[PDB]
Amino acid sequence: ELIRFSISIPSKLLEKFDQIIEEIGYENRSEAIRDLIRDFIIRHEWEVGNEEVAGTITIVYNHGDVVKALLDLQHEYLDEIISSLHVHMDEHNCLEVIVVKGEAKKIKMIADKLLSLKGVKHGKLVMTST
Amino acid sequence: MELIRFSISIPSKLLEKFDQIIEEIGYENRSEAIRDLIRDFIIRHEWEVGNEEVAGTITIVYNHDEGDVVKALLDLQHEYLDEIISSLHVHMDEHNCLEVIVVKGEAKKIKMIADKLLSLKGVKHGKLVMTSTGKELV
Amino acid sequence: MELIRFSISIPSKLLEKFDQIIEEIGYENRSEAIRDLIRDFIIRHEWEVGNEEVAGTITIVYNHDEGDVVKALLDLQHEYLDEIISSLHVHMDEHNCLEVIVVKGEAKKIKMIADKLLSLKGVKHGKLVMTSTGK
Amino acid sequence: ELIRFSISIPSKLLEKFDQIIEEIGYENRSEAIRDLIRDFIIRHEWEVGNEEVAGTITIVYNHDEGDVVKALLDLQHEYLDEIISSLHVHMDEHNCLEVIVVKGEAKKIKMIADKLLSLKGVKHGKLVMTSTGKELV
Ligand SMILES: [Cl-]
Ligand SMILES: [Cl-]
Ligand SMILES: [Mg+2]
Ligand SMILES: [Mg+2]
């Protein structure tokens, strides 16, 4: 069954979108958005409920105060955090990949704590139900 | 700016599962959620065609008995020697393995690395997360 | 300080260069220099005395094009995933790959795992940096 | 081609040495010291010839004491070329393990390691490297 409903997107965005998807080969906006929605579901299902999940927390930030804050938080979740990889990107940007495994609820907690940390510009999760 | 309204047709079953997740994520409504999906979609397509200078990570969770992800990676480490900065591997449990690689380079090549690694059989989940200058992270 | 005098046999070439270096560095004699070498050696291998908990790393160098050394390595690591926390793959050249394995566990088990890894064919070298946890 | 010579070593060290020698598997002192001398020569040569090397710096430390976190950031700035990446692992209440992937000139890699290791809070640590894969010291 198909459900029709309205949606409002900033004009400039809709134009780029319409252009991109016609090129790609989509028949219309709905076909293109159903695909975006299928991937979104696949990327975030892990959040529904509280099962054990594993994955990575990628974050970008720049330099000390935050670097010690990230460490201390890695100490708090000794059980869910396996290890973290730090790569010095450029001059005002550092890359941190944090490997985690545990109850989705604690992972969501660690995440919120990282993203809402002074110095952390962004953060993305690639997480899946183990 | 200017918010434009338009219709969409989506399978009910897909819409239900969608509503439940944006719910849990804390999205205001479907429009706000769909807007983000669209914006990220565009931002990645643009970095692609524009072959922008991106940095990031490629996460792969795969089946130990099925996937030969590591071998695949070691091969690529020679072609894209400049792109692949660091590789981390983790045996999570009896079935799941996690391979995360840090890449830096031109979007087209980096997307090439992702495409390959993600197509390997044995992969359960995986994604390329890249930024250009720390302004976006998709 | 009870000094014990004993003799050892070392190939001339090695000893010649050793004497040259020792002189430069500013050592007075071979005994002094060898004592230092023996001191660092004890520190690096103490963790093997007994069977307490240790943590540290196993660094190996191997040719991934040789047979299925990669699948063998991965299988052995998967088997001991309780002691293997994480691994880093560092590319050297088209054939040579350097991997560093982070581990934690009873010294005895770690020795066992390391012996296996180094025993694999395709693995050229291996080195361990270990220390007991706590103090 | 063997040269035989006499050496003077303090008694307690010799005991701990023989003790380590037995556990490890060496047949005799000569065979063990030969390996120590050879490894020493390989590291020294790489340094004076400031040759190119790849390797790792493993450091186990007390995160409640050491400034490691800081010393690393600082070093990750002056030598952002030789330092490829860093793996951090919180093992237990106290103990922290840091593994730094390095690649560059021996003298600089050596400086980086010496600075990080001579540090406070560091229980144990070592720079493990190879030039072309024929030797791992
Ligand atoms: Cl960006
Ligand atoms: Cl070498
Ligand atoms: Mg949330
Ligand atoms: Mg043995």
From Swiss-Prot, chain A:
The keyword Manganese does not apply. Ni(2+) binds at H75, H86, H88, C94. GO terms for molecular function: DNA binding; DNA-binding transcription factor activity; nickel cation binding. Binds 1 nickel ion per subunit. It holds the Pfam family RHH_1. Keywords: DNA-binding, Metal-binding, Nickel, Transcription, Transcription regulation. The keyword DNA-binding applies. Its cofactor is Ni(2+). GO terms for biological process: response to nickel cation. CDD domains: RHH_NikR_HicB-like. Belongs to the transcriptional regulatory CopG/NikR family. Transcriptional regulator. This is Putative nickel-responsive regulator.
